[PDB]
């Protein structure tokens, strides 16, 4: 694995970086046709387009990559999020906390690809933009105040270490038009979502996310019309100058340490498991032991990658 | 230092005055040292407040010193048996009680009595059996 040995002997990120190599996130409301833009921009500069973080994004990330059972993936339902807001069990907060962990894994995987291959990164919504969902959830009855504090504490502990998005794109369509966009896409859980809740999501971006990041990175606001025109947006990205931002000080000997972090997923989310016992987050020892003693028995997961024979690994007796 | 040692030279139960004086001093000395650490760390709020604490600790310690000395000497006098851990225990017993009072707690007097007295008794035994503390390396 990458180490100071490799750094000492060549393997420097600096010499692998090029103009097209940046961390570009595109953030929008629940429905901004964001997906297309990203894949489009991705297609433009060959940028590895990372999909929006999912409940089982981590399982697709690890081992076989087949989707995990819900309880193995933290028992989070976006579906139940919508049909049962302010639920007794709090699936909505557990959904949000797992989502933050998933993008933490996605952002870290993205940074690892960026510093190793040197190909730039498009990851849709980012950890920085995740807060808008929680702000809106606390604005209504979805989450209580402490729940907010617990997310903020995890965010303050883990997000600063990772370097900021080079530029952020904002595909904005008004509160009413996204709900009609919602109305025609087929899922019924997305439908019937609060107009005021959608109001709080985009308002939270405009009030906090874009100004905040307006110095940390090159924010590119785009209206819907500019959108659906990947060519134009792509053009503008190729147009902005990547100057302002903390990325300027990343010398090779500084990148090495950041790389070795993202290279270690177990650390990336080390502070995501901090022992703060808010009730929704708590596994519980008896349920948690069963869930672990069950997730660990899945084929290829009992032992470390390369050593479990079930999936067809061989040479274990000499590894 | 020739002083403190004197306590041991004269047979126990005899010349209680000297005994009580010496014991009172040792306690008081400990009081000063104890107050000092208590003031250096966990400081006070005003110089006077701390001077008071020094006094409080010094007196309390001086008291435990006195009663220990007095009780042990007298217990031996009245009992007429000079060499007996019990004399000291009664003394340590008393000493603890003074500490308990100064701290205004019956419970402390309990632990104080038992623990303190036992310790003093062991001192007597130690002297009687010639136990050596902090010994030079003789391997």
């Amino acid at each position: 694995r990458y180490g100071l040995l490799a750094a000492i002997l060549g393997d420097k990120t600096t010499k692998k970086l090029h103009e097209y190599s940046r961390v570009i996130t595109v953030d929008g409301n629940i429905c901004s046709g964001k997906n297309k833009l990203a894949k489009e921009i991705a297609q433009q500069l060959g940028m590895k387009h990372y999909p929006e973080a999912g409940i089982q994004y981590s399982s697709t990330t690890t081992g076989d990559g087949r989707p995990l059972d819900i309880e193995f993936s933290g028992s989070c339902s976006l579906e139940k999020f919508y049909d049962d807001p302010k639920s007794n069990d709090g699936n909505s907060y557990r959904l949000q906390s797992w989502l933050y962990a998933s993008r933490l894994l996605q952002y870290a995987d993205a940074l690892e690809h960026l510093l190793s291959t040197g190909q730039g990164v498009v990851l849709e919504r980012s950890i920085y933009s995740d807060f808008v969902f929680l702000e809106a959830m606390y604005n209504q009855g979805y989450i209580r105040k402490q729940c907010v504090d617990h997310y903020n504490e995890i965010k303050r502990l883990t997000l600063p270490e990772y370097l900021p998005p080079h530029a952020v794109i904002y595909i904005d369509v008004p509160v009413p038009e996204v709900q009609s966009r919602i109305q025609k896409k087929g899922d019924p859980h997305e439908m019937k979502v609060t107009s005021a809740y959608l109001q709080d999501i985009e308002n939270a971006y405009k009030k906090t996310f874009l100004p905040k990041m307006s110095e940390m990175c090159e924010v590119l606001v785009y209206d819907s019309w500019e959108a659906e025109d990947p060519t134009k947006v792509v053009e503008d990205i190729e147009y902005l100058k990547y100057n302002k931002g903390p990325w300027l000080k990343q010398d090779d000997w500084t990148f090495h340490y950041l790389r070795m972090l993202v290279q270690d997923k177990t650390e990336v989310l080390n502070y995501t498991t901090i022992p703060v016992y808010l009730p929704e987050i708590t596994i519980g020892a008896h349920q948690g032991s069963r869930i672990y003693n069950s997730f660990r028995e899945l084929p290829g997961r009992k032992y470390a990658p390369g050593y479990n024979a079930e999936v067809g690994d061989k040479w274990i007796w000499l590894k | 230092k020739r002083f403190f040692e004197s306590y041991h030279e004269v047979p126990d139960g005899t010349q209680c005055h000297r005994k009580t004086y010496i014991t009172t001093a040792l306690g008081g000395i400990c009081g000063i040292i104890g107050s000092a650490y208590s003031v250096s760390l966990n400081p006070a709020d005003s110089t006077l407040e701390a001077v008071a604490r020094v006094g409080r600790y010094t007196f309390t310690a001086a008291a435990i010193g006195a009663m220990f000395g007095l009780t042990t000497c007298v217990s031996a006098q009245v009992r007429e048996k000079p060499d007996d851990p019990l004399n000291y225990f009664i003394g340590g017993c008393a000493g603890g009680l003074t500490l308990g009072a100064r701290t205004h707690s019956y419970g402390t007097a309990a632990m104080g009595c038992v623990y303190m007295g036992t310790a003093a008794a062991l001192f007597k035994i130690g002297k009687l059996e010639g136990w050596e503390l902090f010994p030079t390396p003789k391997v």
């Binding site: 069990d89 016992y277 009730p279 708590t282 519980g284 020892a285 008896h286 349920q287 069963r290 | -």
Partner: protein, 100 residues
């Protein structure tokens, strides 16, 4: 509230496996976990053990001493010696502190 499992009930292992012997849920392991426990437990420890322990010979010499007494009592009585003399270590061997 935090997440934890709902109380697990204890199964009536006697509902299935109506021949349950108390060792394990699946029937063959049970049968073979009593056919080997009654056997190694009772059949060759309580039986072979008691046989061997019963046949330990003259344990702690108490079968030897009821004869040695008999020939000593036979010998001492016929030769007129006291059956249990009153000093064991002979007085001659002892070198008592002379002065005291």
């Amino acid at each position: 509230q935090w997440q934890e499992d709902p109380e697990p009930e204890d199964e009536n292992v006697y509902a299935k496996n109506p021949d349950f012997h108390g060792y394990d849920s699946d029937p063959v392991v049970d049968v073979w976990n009593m056919r080997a426990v009654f056997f190694f437990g009772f059949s060759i420890v309580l039986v072979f053990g008691t046989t061997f322990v019963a046949y330990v010979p003259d344990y702690r010499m108490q079968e030897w001493a009821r004869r040695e007494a008999e020939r000593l009592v036979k010998y001492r009585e016929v030769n007129g010696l006291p059956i249990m003399e009153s000093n064991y270590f002979d007085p001659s061997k002892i070198q008592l502190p002379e002065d005291d």
